[PDB]
Amino acid sequence: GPKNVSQKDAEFERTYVDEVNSELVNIYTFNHTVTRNRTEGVRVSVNVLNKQKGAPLLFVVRQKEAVVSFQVPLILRGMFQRKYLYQKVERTLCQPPTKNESEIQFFYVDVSTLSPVNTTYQLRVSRMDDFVLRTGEQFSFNTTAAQPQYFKYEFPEGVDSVIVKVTSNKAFPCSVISIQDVLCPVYDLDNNVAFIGMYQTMTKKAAITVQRKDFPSNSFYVVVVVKTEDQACGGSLPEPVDQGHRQKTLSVLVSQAVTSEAYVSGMLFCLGIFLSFYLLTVLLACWENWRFWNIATIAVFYALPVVQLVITYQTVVNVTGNQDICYYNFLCAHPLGNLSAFNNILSNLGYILLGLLFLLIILQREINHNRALLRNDLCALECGIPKHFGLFYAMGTALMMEGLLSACYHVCPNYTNFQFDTSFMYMIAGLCMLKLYQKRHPDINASAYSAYACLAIVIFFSVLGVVFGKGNTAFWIVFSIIHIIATLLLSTQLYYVDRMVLLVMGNVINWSLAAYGLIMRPNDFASYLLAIGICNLLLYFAFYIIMKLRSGERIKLIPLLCIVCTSVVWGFALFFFFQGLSTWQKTPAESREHNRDCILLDFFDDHDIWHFLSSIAMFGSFLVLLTLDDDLDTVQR
Amino acid sequence: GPKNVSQKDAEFERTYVDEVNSELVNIYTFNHTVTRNRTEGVRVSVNVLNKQKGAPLLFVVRQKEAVVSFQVPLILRGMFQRKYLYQKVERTLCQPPTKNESEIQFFYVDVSTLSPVNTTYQLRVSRMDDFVLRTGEQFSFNTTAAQPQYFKYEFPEGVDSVIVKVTSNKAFPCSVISIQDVLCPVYDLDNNVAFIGMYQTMTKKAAITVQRKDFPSNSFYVVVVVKTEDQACGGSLPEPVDQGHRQKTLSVLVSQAVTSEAYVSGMLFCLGIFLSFYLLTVLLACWENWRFWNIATIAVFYALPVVQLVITYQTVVNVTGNQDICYYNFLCAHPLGNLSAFNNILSNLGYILLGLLFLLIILQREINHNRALLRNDLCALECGIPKHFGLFYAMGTALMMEGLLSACYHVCPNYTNFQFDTSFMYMIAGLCMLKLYQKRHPDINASAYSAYACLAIVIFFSVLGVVFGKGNTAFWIVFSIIHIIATLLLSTQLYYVDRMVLLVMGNVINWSLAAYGLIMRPNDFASYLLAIGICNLLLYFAFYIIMKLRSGERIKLIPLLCIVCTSVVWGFALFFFFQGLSTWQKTPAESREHNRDCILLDFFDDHDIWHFLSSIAMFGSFLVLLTLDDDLDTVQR
Ligand SMILES: *[C@@H]1O[C@H](CO)[C@@H](O[C@@H]2O[C@H](CO)[C@@H](O)[C@H](O)[C@H]2NC(C)=O)[C@H](O)[C@H]1NC(C)=O
Ligand SMILES: *[C@@H]1O[C@H](CO)[C@@H](O[C@@H]2O[C@H](CO)[C@@H](O)[C@H](O)[C@H]2NC(C)=O)[C@H](O)[C@H]1NC(C)=O
Ligand SMILES: *[C@@H]1O[C@H](CO)[C@@H](O[C@@H]2O[C@H](CO)[C@@H](O)[C@H](O)[C@H]2NC(C)=O)[C@H](O)[C@H]1NC(C)=O
Ligand SMILES: *[C@@H]1O[C@H](CO)[C@@H](O[C@@H]2O[C@H](CO)[C@@H](O)[C@H](O)[C@H]2NC(C)=O)[C@H](O)[C@H]1NC(C)=O
Ligand SMILES: *[C@@H]1O[C@H](CO)[C@@H](O)[C@H](O)[C@H]1NC(C)=O
Ligand SMILES: *[C@@H]1O[C@H](CO)[C@@H](O)[C@H](O)[C@H]1NC(C)=O
């Protein structure tokens, strides 16, 4: 008729080996003492032995204000109707903050089974002394898919933001690191975990900025969960299948985030240099002298897509809390307002102020030229090299529009959102091809449409590469061969001592870039083709310099200095562009094992320094084009 | 020392009124008999009475192969640290499919509390006889936030796809309708629910297509959950707060989906008419006679964004199962392959074949014109009206590109993804303004750039309206006044009997459209401005006809027929364009209470008929422009 019920008084830190059957139920009564100030965490471990296939043990932990219950061997879901089985289950117990200063709290563990044979479990309830996290101290722990871990941080006084950094040494147990408030329960199951709070799938790295304003209890729970499968982290997979051998050893560090002097140090470093250029130029001019809207039209046909998509799409995460959508550099992302990576946006102040200053140069030069025309001298276009500021204006505005088309990319950098930032750098890379060429020929408008078509073709090839973002080896070699063919065909179009010497030093760099693209197989294709863009640009600059050099004229120092400085800055910028060029892989999990701290002035990482050197180098090359054949203001041949 | 444990034998369909305290535990033992063929569902209801604030009851349902456990009064989360409290909790019990043909199965209900005073619950375990769903039979039920319901469907033989339709009568309890397989457990909690399966937040309507290939058990569970708050369905909100009065009365119907004859009936109806046009024209021509890439360049600058974004973004849902992302017409969406709304994509076969046929017309006419030029007659441009097929080619290709720019919108129609489909209809609406105008003037290229700028300005206003998609009343009235100002300014530019009579019938329709835009305040702005586009287009056509009518010439019938037929088809198309024009609101929940069944041939809804009549009307108007001033091939004044 009735069952045996064995009610017994148990203790902490003492393994209990008992056994139950279909007609026995074991009820253990643990107690402890909780204190207002110091907190502690009970963790229950249960482990059946040589378990039979009949019926699981069923465990119930009853507290004053919550009930937890599971069934051991725990069975978790695969993906395509697969089941994984764990002989060993553990959970920490959520307990609401205490009211009294110290009190005694009980809780009972109920073990029962419906299997008609004995089963020998192994209960053990243990106190946790490393529950609370401390600011700046690394701390390790192990957790399988059946043993979700969680710890508790609470902000000190005067810390209004921290950043949680979790880092494992191996890649293929997956994980989720959620950060929730301290209101029980705690969603730390494979299904509950993504319900609230901000989470991040991790493979080797995870980082989450947390702010005090979110949590009125001045604390939060860091919850670490390990997934049954590694598909969502790039891995591959081959009735229940035993999977109790798969741990993950982690390390959690919670350090304070920059307060306010980083912000001002970022502004007062953008403004303190990009205005240095302004003053330098305006003071140089006095010494020297006293000793239509097509770009914006295309940008407006693209902007409402870019602007609306990115603005709406950031808010989606900002209201969701799923940080696997936008591919920031989470170690260096210092949010202001609703902007997550604020520094990745000031870093585009260069392009803006530099395109603007280039325009303000061209304006003055054009009106000076028309005033000198009103002086009625023979140096209209014969004694000089025919002036056409129409394309200089184009460069000076395209730089401005680049300082906006990527400042919107760096709001949710993403797989789809990519081509915005770097494709617009081909346009400005194309114009330098035009003007230089145009600087030796009367009509280029017939080839201007062809240049627009060539840029569109490059963008289409970039789109194709982005579509096959997992580009096969055949994919890579196909582009390799077609680009070598393009180089070989382009060598002919430029046809002596140095005329053919150019080809000696061109094909080698073509091969070198292709070889690195093949061997690295970088996930990024457009930003890789950009490297070829700059390489061709610099080679063309050098070649035109060489051809100008086989005439008995003399280059004035004022542009020669520009050539050398622009070359050196392009030396820097490609370095900081290759440091981050592999830092973007398929899945946000391993697109996160390439992050890195803020390098310069606590606020800017690599990419934020490339957003600087790129603008300064391109401005330097603009001035090179403006002033390169400047000395030829007398010869009318 | 030890507790009282009262183990008792209970029965189904019999309310149990008992009471427990800190030192009593009640264990009820229910049993039943399960059969291989017929299935049934146990549903437990528990209801504490006049509950005190101390400590909840804790309930545990232990079965052979699963453990469920909750705590009554159940407390669920608000949004900003709010708690809602339910004195009444129910759950159905998942039980795995039985092995034997019939067997006896036990399960125990454990009720216990840690409160040191009596608490009077009310247990009741009831069998469910309407667990299994049947194909084609409506069925109702009630469910609060604490009582998640779920039922079981299993496909018959010969049904490889069904569509679940759930429809409530009131709007502000929210819901989630998940559809999962029949492997226990069943995720029917506010946190588990979105873990697997395909779900849909509902307010008044929900529909989910389900296919047999997904489920190897030839069955699935429909799970209905009611949310604590209505924020994610457009509603607004004002220690635990009692919320036990908020039900939701639903109705679930699971009907078979179209097998294959709908698909062929859709193709053989697109091909059976858009080729009727082909044969009609090619046979008309014999009787009558025997009795550069700018559009594609803009489309390519937009396509890789459109193509890549939409293709990637459909797969996101297709691998997620969260159907609150893409705004289909779920009642009419007949998927093929990975395409959800396949019919919404064939419906753009018109634009393709009709733009193509228009081009093939223009080609023949141009070569006929050049051959006639080789005949060396005086009717070069004087005796006729100056021929320039350059813009006719533009229309004939822009229609093709519209049959692709919206056929990609109708893959995940969305808030961001919108402007693709209808903005490209302004371009073709603009060209008809040009050519007609161009048909009376020698130079329009000076105003061609202005027309491009005007279209860009309209697109920018559309983008601004889309950004403020929740446009305020001040927003609407601002556009109202500025558009009336635009109409008043445009009236002057066209300056008699009828010259000023035109203005009498123009401002009235301007006011009428503005008034309907204000009163309805449609969520869609660009597609609303399109109505003004067609209205202005038709008025301009009529006006040019009137001015041609005050000359003593005679319009040939061949274009006059075209005028009248194009007018009537534009009569139809605007009707089907207004039937779906409010069917797109802010949230996918209520963007779903405007769906409707497939109207024509089991396969096409309203919007799929507008994708037809729009193409045919625009093609008709193209031929009107081509043939309108055709008779003037003799007059050289
Ligand atoms: C609360 O603590 C433990 C439960 O783990 C119970 O066990 C004994 O407690 C006494 C002190 O009160 C000590 O002898 C030991 O800590 C325990 N006994 C042994 C043999 O180790 C204790 O009785 C519990 N108290 C109540 C009121 O339940
Ligand atoms: C987590 O990592 C391992 C998981 O196996 C735990 O056991 C250690 O494993 C390696 C090799 O056996 C060594 O680090 C030690 O010899 C093992 N520890 C022993 C035997 O006690 C390891 O203890 C765990 N580390 C924690 C919890 O900090
Ligand atoms: C299984 O069924 C019920 C539990 O609801 C138990 O109760 C009695 O069953 C007998 C028939 O076996 C009938 O008299 C009634 O259905 C129940 N009694 C009364 C007074 O209504 C039954 O004993 C259970 N059997 C076992 C073996 O547990
Ligand atoms: C679900 O709807 C109501 C929820 O209150 C249930 O009760 C009915 O409510 C209205 C007004 O009282 C009427 O339809 C009936 O008079 C009520 N039913 C009664 C008194 O039995 C209703 O029963 C539920 N319908 C179901 C479960 O089908
Ligand atoms: C437990 O079961 C045994 C026999 O199985 C019986 O003698 C005893 O009375 C039961 N109850 C106990 C030990 O409390
Ligand atoms: C502490 O003691 C009990 C413990 O719950 C309860 O009365 C209350 O929380 C506190 N009361 C006093 C008087 O401190």
Ligand SMILES: *[C@@H]1O[C@H](CO)[C@@H](O)[C@H](O)[C@H]1NC(C)=O
């Ligand atoms: C099962 O467990 C009980 C509890 O100790 C034990 O007495 C018994 O011998 C075991 N084996 C069987 C067959 O009951």
Ligand SMILES: *[C@@H]1O[C@H](CO)[C@@H](O)[C@H](O)[C@H]1NC(C)=O
């Ligand atoms: C239940 O408690 C009562 C007193 O509270 C005691 O007399 C009895 O022995 C206990 N056990 C039962 C009724 O099984």
Ligand SMILES: *[C@@H]1O[C@H](CO)[C@@H](O)[C@H](O)[C@H]1NC(C)=O
């Ligand atoms: C039916 O009876 C029991 C019930 O579990 C078990 O042996 C098995 O499921 C079936 N056995 C036979 C012989 O049918």
Ligand SMILES: *[C@@H]1O[C@H](CO)[C@@H](O)[C@H](O)[C@H]1NC(C)=O
């Ligand atoms: C509490 O419940 C028990 C169980 O019936 C009852 O005997 C008792 O009178 C109730 N009240 C108190 C104060 O114990």
Ligand SMILES: [Zn+2]
């Ligand atoms: Zn960038």
Ligand SMILES: [Zn+2]
């Ligand atoms: Zn459409």
